[PDB]
Design a protein around this ligand. Sequence first.
Ligand code: 1DT
Ligand code: PHU
Length: 277
Amino acid sequence: TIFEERHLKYISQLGKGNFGSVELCRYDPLGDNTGALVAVKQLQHSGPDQQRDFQREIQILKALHSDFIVKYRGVSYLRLVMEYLPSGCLRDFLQRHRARLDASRLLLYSSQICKGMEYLGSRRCVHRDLAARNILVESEAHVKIADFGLAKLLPLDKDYYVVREPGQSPIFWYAPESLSDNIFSRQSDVWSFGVVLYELFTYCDKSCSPSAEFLRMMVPALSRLLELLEEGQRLPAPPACPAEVHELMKLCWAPSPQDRPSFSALGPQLDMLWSGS
Ligand SMILES: C[C@H](NC(=O)c1c[nH]c2ncc(Oc3ccccc3)nc12)C1CC1
Ligand SMILES: NC(=O)Nc1ccccc1
């Protein structure tokens, strides 16, 4: 649980985002290159607000225990040590392996992500950055939610959270209430899950990505996106998308957070489709 810094050997950068970076390191206390590989998050550079956020992220991740959430391994004193999943993120894995991954498998990943989100919700955790680029692949048939850099715990007496600064993530995964009023909730994570189902079923192809679709659907982009959403415009069904999968996405994109299903209602539905595919 406590890793000594001198034993963590730097290999490469894995990714970066919201003021943090994740490195691939070997935890190599013998110094002979035989130790296990780990992913180590740290701030990219120092700053006291980032620091306080980072401490909370660590406390959140340490207290999450799910097969569908990336595993906390410990800390180094300033760094968060996590399991390293060499297949990397689901966005990349989908683009590389599309020819091999059928509808059944995408429904399997969808069910696993839903089940991880159901668990997060039970912990009063709003993830706030759900997207295929932040889901990791453990094996061919197992994914895990990662990137808790923006995650918040809801107080016991309130089911939403208002953020003060504007968001910094690609705008096409945010719910309308987040776009307009910086409100985030478990039901805003359901909106984002609908976009994740869209990514899965397009295999993260860049030409039909959420972003590419907006510049086709056509004043600042954020205001334009909100007007398009208020008018009831949505991303079109992915090529060859099963009808029932598309209906589920549209339900996740109900205008009113209270009309979106919960992850507990979504889960059984995905399983039934997975069993019926
Ligand atoms: C960069 C962040 N990654 C993590 O926090 C990771 C924690 N363990 C990992 N194992 C492999 C892996 O592989 C990669 C490599 C490149 C891009 C994404 C994941 N990334 C991570 C973010 C995805 C959640
Ligand atoms: N959720 C949803 O349908 N979002 C959207 C719509 C148009 C363009 C980009 C994203």
